[PDB]
Amino acid sequence: LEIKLEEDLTVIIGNNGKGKTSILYAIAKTLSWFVANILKEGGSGQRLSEMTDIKNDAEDRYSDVSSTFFFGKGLKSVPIRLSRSALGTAERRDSEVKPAKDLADIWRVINEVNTINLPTFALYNVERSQPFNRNIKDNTGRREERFDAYSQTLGGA
DNA sequence: GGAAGCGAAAGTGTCGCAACCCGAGAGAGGAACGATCTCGGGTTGCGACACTTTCGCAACCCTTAATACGTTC
RNA sequence: UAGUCGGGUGAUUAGCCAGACUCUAACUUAUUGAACGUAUU
Ligand SMILES: Nc1ncnc2c1ncn2[C@@H]1O[C@H](COP(=O)(O)OP(=O)(O)O)[C@@H](O)[C@H]1O
Incomplete structure (x- = not known):
């Protein structure tokens, strides 16, 4: 499947069990690498599940999620691919996440300087939509500091 | 392909809290014996969370390259 | 309207001027090796 995400607003519609939540989940997994490498040099983002994400039928028992990002005329493409192979497969497929690390390294280094x-x-x-608010004191890292805005930012809630 | 570090993802154990049970005990009433509410352990179920295991990113570039100037793979 | 193409001007990778295009839809890449162009030759 291929999608042509709009620059400002994109709406995905369909019946139940068509893959809209799957598309959002894949995009969030892709953005996790940007977040992690902004927070932490060479940081590791989220990865595709080897138990549920690969198509049940399949032909090669692996799944790929390719994304391309635009950051102006100076950086017209930032290709990042998340790949995972199913359980019990001799050949494991790797992910191509280096350009995202490079862009986030640019962001982080320039920001610190x-x-x-x-x-x-x-x-x-x-x-x-979970109930309640402020369940625990949540000793988690000083909400005041700037890089607390990237904490659990792609968790869903 | 994959050092060395490290963190994601998933599975498993554990451990504290709540909820209840059960025997002991001082003694309400009203004329005695012991109702009834509480104290102190003890057991079990449960779920949040810590702990455990596996995977994967990607150093280096191996003895072993050539060195007019430009694109391309 | 965007976006794209690029003829001109421009101490010139920028800015501007004229013109044109639109399958749902470019993102310019890699050497010393191979071939191509060019220069010595
Ligand atoms: N690994 C898989 N292989 C095949 N089908 C799958 C797999 N995982 C999910 N599905 C199916 O794809 C759909 C996924 O639903 P989802 O992405 O949440 O869609 P939506 O948000 O449109 O309801 C469901 O119909 C589910 O049965």
């Missing part, structure tokens, strides 16, 4: 505006990556899935 001189403060810049950082991009926002958020996922609001069905795990939202």
